[PDB]
Amino acid sequence: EHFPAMVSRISGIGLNGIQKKVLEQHATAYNEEVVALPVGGFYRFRKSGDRHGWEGGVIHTLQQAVTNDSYTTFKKYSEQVNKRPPMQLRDLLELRSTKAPVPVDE
Amino acid sequence: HQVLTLNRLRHRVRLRTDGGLKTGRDIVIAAMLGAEEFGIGTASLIAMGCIMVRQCHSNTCPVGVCVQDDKLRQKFVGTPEKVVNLFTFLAEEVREILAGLGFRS
Amino acid sequence: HITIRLRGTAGQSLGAFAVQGIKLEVMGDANDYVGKGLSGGTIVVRPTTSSPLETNKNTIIGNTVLYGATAGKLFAAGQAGERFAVRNSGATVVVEGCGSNGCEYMTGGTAVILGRVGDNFAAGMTGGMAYVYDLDDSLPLYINDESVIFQRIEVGHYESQLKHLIEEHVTETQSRFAAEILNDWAREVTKFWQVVPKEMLNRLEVPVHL
Amino acid sequence: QDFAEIYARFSDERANEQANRCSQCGVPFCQVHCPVSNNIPDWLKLTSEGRLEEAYEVSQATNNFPEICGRICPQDRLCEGNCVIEQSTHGAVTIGSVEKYINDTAWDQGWVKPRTPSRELGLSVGVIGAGPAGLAAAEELRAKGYEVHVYDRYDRMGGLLVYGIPGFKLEKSVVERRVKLLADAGVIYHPNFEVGRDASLPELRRKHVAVLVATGVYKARDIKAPGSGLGNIVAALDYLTTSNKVSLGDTVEAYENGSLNAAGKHVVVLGGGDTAMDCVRTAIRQGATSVKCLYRRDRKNMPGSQREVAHAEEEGVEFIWQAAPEGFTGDTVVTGVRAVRIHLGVADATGRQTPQVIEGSEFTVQADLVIKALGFEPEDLPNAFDEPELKVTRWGTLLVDHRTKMTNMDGVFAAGDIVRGASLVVWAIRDGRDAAEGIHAYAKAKAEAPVAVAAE
Numbered sequence: 001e002h003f004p005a006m007v008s009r010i011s012g013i014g015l016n017g018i019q020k021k022v023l024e025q026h027a028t029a030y031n032e033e034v035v036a037l038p039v040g041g042f043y044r045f046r047k048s049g050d051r052h053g054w055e056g057g058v059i060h061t062l063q064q065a066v067t068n069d070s071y072t073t074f075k076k077y078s079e080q081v082n083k084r085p086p087m088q089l090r091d092l093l094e095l096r097s098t099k100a101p102v103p104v105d106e
Numbered sequence: 107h108q109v110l111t112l113n114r115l116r117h118r119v120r121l122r123t124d125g126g127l128k129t130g131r132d133i134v135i136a137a138m139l140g141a142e143e144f145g146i147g148t149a150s151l152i153a154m155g156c157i158m159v160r161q162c163h164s165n166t167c168p169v170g171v172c173v174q175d176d177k178l179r180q181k182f183v184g185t186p187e188k189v190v191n192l193f194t195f196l197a198e199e200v201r202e203i204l205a206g207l208g209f210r211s
Numbered sequence: 212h213i214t215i216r217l218r219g220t221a222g223q224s225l226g227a228f229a230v231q232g233i234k235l236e237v238m239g240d241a242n243d244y245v246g247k248g249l250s251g252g253t254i255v256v257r258p259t260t261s262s263p264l265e266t267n268k269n270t271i272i273g274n275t276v277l278y279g280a281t282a283g284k285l286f287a288a289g290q291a292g293e294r295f296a297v298r299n300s301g302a303t304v305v306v307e308g309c310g311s312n313g314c315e316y317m318t319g320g321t322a323v324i325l326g327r328v329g330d331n332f333a334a335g336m337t338g339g340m341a342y343v344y345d346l347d348d349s350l351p352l353y354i355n356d357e358s359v360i361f362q363r364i365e366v367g368h369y370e371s372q373l374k375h376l377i378e379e380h381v382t383e384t385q386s387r388f389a390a391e392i393l394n395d396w397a398r399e400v401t402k403f404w405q406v407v408p409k410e411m412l413n414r415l416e417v418p419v420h421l
Numbered sequence: 422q423d424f425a426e427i428y429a430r431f432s433d434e435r436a437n438e439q440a441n442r443c444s445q446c447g448v449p450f451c452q453v454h455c456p457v458s459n460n461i462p463d464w465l466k467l468t469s470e471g472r473l474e475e476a477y478e479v480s481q482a483t484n485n486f487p488e489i490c491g492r493i494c495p496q497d498r499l500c501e502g503n504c505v506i507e508q509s510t511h512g513a514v515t516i517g518s519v520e521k522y523i524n525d526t527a528w529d530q531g532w533v534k535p536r537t538p539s540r541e542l543g544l545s546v547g548v549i550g551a552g553p554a555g556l557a558a559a560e561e562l563r564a565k566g567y568e569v570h571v572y573d574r575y576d577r578m579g580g581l582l583v584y585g586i587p588g589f590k591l592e593k594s595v596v597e598r599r600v601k602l603l604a605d606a607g608v609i610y611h612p613n614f615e616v617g618r619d620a621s622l623p624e625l626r627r628k629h630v631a632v633l634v635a636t637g638v639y640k641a642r643d644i645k646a647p648g649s650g651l652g653n654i655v656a657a658l659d660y661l662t663t664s665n666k667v668s669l670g671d672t673v674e675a676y677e678n679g680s681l682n683a684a685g686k687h688v689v690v691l692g693g694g695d696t697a698m699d700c701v702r703t704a705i706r707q708g709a710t711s712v713k714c715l716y717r718r719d720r721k722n723m724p725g726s727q728r729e730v731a732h733a734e735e736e737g738v739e740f741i742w743q744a745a746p747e748g749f750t751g752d753t754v755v756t757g758v759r760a761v762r763i764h765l766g767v768a769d770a771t772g773r774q775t776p777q778v779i780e781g782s783e784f785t786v787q788a789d790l791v792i793k794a795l796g797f798e799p800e801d802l803p804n805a806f807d808e809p810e811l812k813v814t815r816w817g818t819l820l821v822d823h824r825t826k827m828t829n830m831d832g833v834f835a836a837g838d839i840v841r842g843a844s845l846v847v848w849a850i851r852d853g854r855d856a857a858e859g860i861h862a863y864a865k866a867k868a869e870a871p872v873a874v875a876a877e
């Protein structure tokens with residue numbers, strides 16, 4: 001409807017959401033009181049609200065894992081990493097299959 | 107993957123991908139979308155010690171990773187062994203998943 | 212130079228005739244003839260990091276281990292079975308126990324043994340050396356005098372060779388029990404027994420006595 | 422013998438030098454690594470400018486006890502641990518030091534901390550224990566605009582900060598400054614009330630909207646058996662406080678005329694953590710000729726961070742320390758109504774890594790004084806009884822949701838050492854911090870007024 005021709009291989013939010021998010025952010029600045037702009041953690045993880053894939057915790061566990069050389073430690077890092085809220089499209093995909101499990105050795 | 111398939115050229119070339127893959131599943135999903143080889147940098151950098159402080163352009167790397175300065179380079183504790191481990195895990199983590207889906211490869 | 216980690220169980224003749232440059236870590240366990248004819252290569256066998264087993268109270272490698280070896284190291288976090296080190300001609304090995312007929316016909320190399328040893332130990336052992344941690348002073352009932360003697364370590368050059376091997380063993384093997392003997396060397400050294408072939412007594416650069 | 426500021430970290434105005442040094446990094450790792458999530462780039466930038474008030478404000482906003490934390494926080498484990506400059510020759514910035522300095526100037530200014538206009542005003546809220554956890558919780562709540570009272574067992578306030586952490590590390594005036602700032606809020610503190618026979622949760626239920634259980638871990642660990650101070654033995658619980666009272670002026674009205682405890686001859690301190698190292702150092706303060714720190718476990722796995730172990734080491738305290746397993750104290754021998762020695766057994770780690778004690782090998786260490794550092798725990802039954810109905814975990818500690826820090830009872834919350842899950846001042850302050858929002862949500866619900874979700 002509104003812009004020149006550009007692809008958008010996945011529709012996303014629309015006017016309604018836009019509206020909403022716009023307004024929320026507006027409250028924050030008027031339907032309340034504000035001293036300064038927050039810090040920001042876009043360009044760099046602070047221990048802010050903008051998350052990141054690589055944030056200290058996980059990094060540690062990785063480094064650990066691969067120094068002490070435990071697969072187990074590795075395995076908690078991945079979990080640290082896999083248990084968050086979605087941040088990336090693959091994150092929106094589950095993996096179901098219709099075969100029954102085979103033994104790892106195979 | 108698609109188009110190449112649609113033109114019957116998709117068997118002529120191998121596909122590889124990279125971008126933030128940090129994990130077993132990240133790799134499996136890539137495969138299913140069609141990839142056959144996966145590229146792993148940053149994470150392998152981190153295992154050699156990067157701490158993600160973003161001063162690569164600056165030549166002040168806390169850890170001997172992205173820096174030409176001597177003194178700084180002496181702080182490097184990277185190891186073939188460490189990296190090797192990184193891959194070794196990812197892999198096993200992959201096989202773990204496959205066997206989950208009932209596939210043996 | 213080429214190291215191959217293997218989880219699982221090694222079938223017979225693991226590492227047979229391995230020359231130097233090759234290292235085999237078997238995490239899990241192995242069968243008979245580990246290191247048969249070892250030839251400068253190194254073989255290591257230790258339980259899984261997740262096994263609740265007490266290293267030195269369980270078997271981990273088979274029989275006729277290192278038969279006829281001439282060089283290389285072998286380290287094993289656990290007991291070996293029958294005729295261990297039979298005919299060893301020159302390999303160095305640390306193990307946490309062993310079946311009967313140990314170090315028989317040995318003609319070289321060194322063999323440390325972190326634990327009980329069975330019958331007829333050392334029979335026919337004309338040369339190499341063996342140390343043997345013996346918490347109950349029973350070695351005397353199990354050994355085969357005829358060609359060998361045993362004494363507590365006295366000279367410290369020997370006392371040092373021992374310690375260093377055991378440290379290697381640990382290192383590779385990541386073995387608690389051994390790790391612990393080192394933690395208490397002082398009192399523990401006191402418990403080994405240097406087993407020395409008769410015919411080597413006088414041939415030996417650093418005497419074993421004084 | 423005497424308590425000067427041993428801290429290496431402490432900075433003079435010279436702090437300006439390091440402030441400039443700080444990269445003032447984006448999405449700084451250090452802040453992410455800070456429990457209270459202090460905006461370290463901004464406060465540091467501020468000191469660089471020289472506007473100490475600004476940094477102080479930034480510090481206090483996130484943590485109410487910014488002063489104490491700057492001095493005490495095991496930074497290497499914490500914010501400095503992820504400092505980017507660590508890659509550099511110079512090394513990580515001493516964020517703790519800059520935090521202390523900025524805070525100190527603010528103290529000098531003598532500004533009072535005002536209240537925000539208003540909110541669901543406040544049915545009575547009670548907090549038990551005057552330590553970091555309660556003070557933080559109380560101050561945030563007051564920021565919300567509630568009427569709150571903290572009931573403290575002891576005459577003194579501040580918790581461990583006052584009682585145990587040594588003056589040389591933690592000056593008493595510091596804790597006093599923070600409590601006063603909180604007080605400006607109107608939080609009321611009353612000193613000789615105890616959660617026990619006198620006060621109980623049901624008693625509070627008699628008119629009281631919410632309660633926060635801040636009491637920490639009041640008692641110390643067991644092996645000494647009836648042993649007396651006269652004989653020799655002192656638990657960290659006994660020892661630290663006596664040194665504290667003599668050493669810190671504001672703490673008690675009475676002057677400890679008794680003076681510092683007379684510790685003479687060899688002193689054996691048993692413990693790996695912060696407690697042991699502080700007792701080791703305090704002991705020399707009271708005239709100890711020699712101090713030995715005995716660890717069950719190996720040197721490698723000393724609990725305290727390197728900066729604090731460093732203080733003892735410089736001090737020349739000896740660490741008999743070996744094997745992961747316990748140099749474990751079997752028995753204390755007392756002759757002449759005085760402790761002559763302590764008997765230990767050597768311990769060593771097996772492949773299992775489970776500790777083993779080898780009875781055959783024993784050590785008789787001569788010692789005139791023994792101080793047991795092992796740690797603290799709750800065990801006072803009337804105290805526990807005070808807590809009912811609230812559920813206790815099989816660690817015998819009050820169960821709380823990690824996020825809300827709510828107890829089984831919706832009205833009651835808990836935080837700090839009592840939770841058994843963190844053992845640092847900044848985590849304790851954080852506990853109170855997090856709790857305050859939830860108590861707020863709960864009370865407001867009572868008010869029938871909503872709280873967003875975001876919390877702020």
Ligand SMILES: Cc1cc2nc3c(=O)[nH]c(=O)nc-3n(C[C@H](O)[C@H](O)[C@H](O)COP(=O)(O)OP(=O)(O)OC[C@H]3O[C@@H](n4cnc5c(N)ncnc54)[C@H](O)[C@@H]3O)c2cc1C
Pocket residue numbers: 493494495549550551552553554555572573574575578579580581582585586614615616617635636637638639657661695696697699804836837838839843844845846847849
């Ligand atoms: C020797 C030592 C050294 C330390 N050094 C450091 C350091 O360098 N850095 C650091 O970050 N942390 C350090 N800590 C830890 C830190 O002091 C604690 O994590 C922190 O004080 C815990 O705060 P809190 O409010 O939970 O409890 P405190 O334990 O701090 O507070 C509990 C309060 O409750 C009162 N109370 C107890 N029982 C009752 C009852 N029944 N009714 C009413 N009131 C009661 C107590 O008198 C006290 O005032 C140290 C601890 C010790 C013991």
Ligand SMILES: Cc1cc2nc3c(=O)[nH]c(=O)nc-3n(C[C@H](O)[C@H](O)[C@H](O)COP(=O)(O)O)c2cc1C
Pocket residue numbers: 124125126127145146147148149162172
């Ligand atoms: C420090 C660094 C240097 C890079 N240099 C090159 C390069 O010289 N040539 C290139 O083609 N891609 C280069 N890349 C990108 C990687 O080659 C690969 O495409 C991508 O780096 C992987 O990033 P990832 O770990 O997020 O998956 C570089 C990436 C990094 C971080």
Ligand code: SF4
Pocket residue numbers: 442443444445446449450451452461462465503504505506513514516
């Ligand atoms: S802003 Fe924080 S203390 Fe300063 S250099 Fe260390 S990580 Fe960046």
Ligand code: SF4
Pocket residue numbers: 454455456457458459461484487490491494496499500501516517520847
């Ligand atoms: S309160 Fe946060 S952890 Fe302690 S930024 Fe300051 S000294 Fe570091």
Ligand code: F3S
Pocket residue numbers: 155156157158159160161162163166167168169171172
């Ligand atoms: S930490 Fe990694 S971020 Fe770049 S600057 Fe250093 S290589």
